[PDB]
């Protein structure tokens, strides 16, 4: 349940990333928000997680506005947000099985169902022979999918993704796009962001652009 009023994101460098943005989406539909390199698509997905303050403006999530919320319940929001990031933000000091199983340990699930859930999340993305391995020797195509497998566990209500299928081949990019469209029959909001156009032009849900924060 994402709703945007007139917000304005500005960094400490005095550069207007997003001047005026306003969009609203029903809970349980995909989107394919794209743009050029100078557009602020990833920081637009970052304001939804609440890691970056919206400065001037009001942003709605479900039924509570994340504008003046205290830091004690800031990270309670992101437990239901399955965001993958620009660089694949992993824990390089620990193995891939404990890397994927971070939110299950966070949510407090029992240890017998952690292995089944992680193996089920790694079946659909295709990482079985390279389990119990470290992310140092995984190549970047695998490390980008490790974050995806980390974001598809414990059935998040709201799913965000900024350029997956970047290090991934076109044959498997279509497969992980049907993986996202396999989650989007049970109620989940998907906010797929990307740069390529050829593998997203075969569908149309919320295909929208971004030019310095402008929409239409």
Partner 1 sequence: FNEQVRYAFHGALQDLKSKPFATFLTVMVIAISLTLPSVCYMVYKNVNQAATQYYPSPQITVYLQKTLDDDAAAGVVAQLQAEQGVEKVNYLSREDALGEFRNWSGFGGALDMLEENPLPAVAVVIPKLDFQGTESLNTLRDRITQINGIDEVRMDDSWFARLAALTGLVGRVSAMIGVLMVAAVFLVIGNSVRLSIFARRDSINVQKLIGATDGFILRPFLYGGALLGFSGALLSLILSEILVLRLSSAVAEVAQVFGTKFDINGLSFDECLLLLLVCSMIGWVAAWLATVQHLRHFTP
Ligand X SMILES: Nc1ncnc2c1ncn2[C@@H]1O[C@H](COP(=O)(O)OP(=O)(O)OP(=O)(O)O)[C@@H](O)[C@H]1O
Q: Is 40 annotated as a binding residue?
A: yes
Does 8 interact with ligand X (rule: CB under 6 A)? Answer: no
Tell me whether strands 32-33 and 158-162 are parallel, antiparallel or unpaired: unpaired
Does 163 interact with a second copy (rule: CB under 8 A)? Answer: yes
Which of these ranges, 19-27, 33-41, 68-76, 172-180, lies near partner 1 under the rule CB under 8 A? 68-76
Helix (H) or strand (E) holding 83: strand 81-84
Does 186 interact with a second copy (rule: CB under 8 A)? Answer: no
Does 26 interact with ligand X (rule: CB under 6 A)? Answer: no
Taking the CA atoms of residue 118, residue 120, residue 124 and residue 126 in that order, the dihedral angle to the nearest 10 degrees is 60
Q: Is 140 annotated as a binding residue?
A: no
Q: Which two tokens stand for residue 52?
A: 């970056």
Contact 157, 188 (CB under 8 A): yes
Largest CA distance in the chain: 50
Does 187 interact with a second copy (rule: CB under 8 A)? Answer: no
**Residues contributing to the annotated binding site for ATP:** 35-42
Applying CB under 6 A, the residues found at the interface with ligand X are 11-13, 15, 17, 37-43, 86, 137-142, 167, 169
**Residues contributing to the annotated binding site:** 35-42
């Amino acid at each position: 349940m994402i709703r945007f009023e007139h917000v304005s994101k500005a960094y400490l460098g005095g550069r207007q990333a997003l001047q005026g943005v306003t969009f609203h989406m029903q809970p349980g539909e995909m989107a394919f928000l794209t743009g050029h390199s100078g557009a602020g698509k990833s920081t637009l997905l970052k304001l939804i997680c609440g890691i970056e303050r919206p400065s001037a403006g009001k942003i709605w999530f479900s039924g509570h506005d994340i504008t003046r919320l205290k830091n004690r319940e800031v990270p309670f929001l992101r437990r239901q947000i399955g965001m993958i990031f620009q660089d694949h933000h992993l824990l390089m000091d620990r193995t891939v099985y404990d890397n994927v199983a971070i939110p299950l340990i966070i949510a407090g699930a029992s240890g017998d169902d952690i292995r089944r859930r992680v193996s089920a999340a790694l079946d659909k993305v295709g990482l079985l022979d390279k389990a119990k391995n470290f992310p140092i020797q995984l190549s970047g195509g695998e490390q980008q999918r490790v974050g995806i497998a980390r974001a598809v566990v414990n059935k998040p209500a709201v799913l965000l993704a900024d350029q997956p299928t970047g290090n991934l081949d076109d044959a498997l990019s279509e497969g992980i796009l049907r993986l996202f469209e396999e989650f989007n029959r049970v109620g989940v909001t998907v906010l797929m962001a990307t740069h390529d156009i050829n593998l997203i032009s075969r569908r149309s849900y919320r295909m929208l652009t971004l030019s310095d924060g402008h929409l239409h």
